[PDB]
Structure 1
Amino acid sequence: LRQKLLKEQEEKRLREKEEQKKLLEQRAQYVEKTKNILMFT
């Protein structure tokens, strides 16, 4: 049970950290695009 719980917690940590990093990179690319079209307005 100890082994199973440690494996599950490490998996959930890696999954959430990866998803947050991917959303940050998508937001950063869109931040560059909106910087280009926002500075003129």
Structure 2
Amino acid sequence: RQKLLKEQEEKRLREKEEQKKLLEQRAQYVEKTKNILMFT
């Protein structure tokens, strides 16, 4: 049972890594959307 809980929390860690990658992509999209704007 304890091993099941640790595997679940590790799946939560991978969820959080997804969260930081998503914030990262959103974070560079604000810098980049400027380039799609100035491109035209």
**TM-score, structure 1 as length reference:** 0.65
What percent identity do the matched residue pairs reach?
Answer: 100
Deviations 1:1-41 (A, max 9, x none): x1221111111110001111111111110111114544898
Q: Which runs of 5+ in 1 are unaligned?
A: none
In the TM superposition, structure 1's runs of 4+ consecutive aligned residues that sit over 4 Å from their partners are none
Structure 1 vs Structure 2 CA RMSD: 2.1
Q: Number of residues paired by the alignment?
A: 40
TM-score, normalising length: structure 2 = 0.66
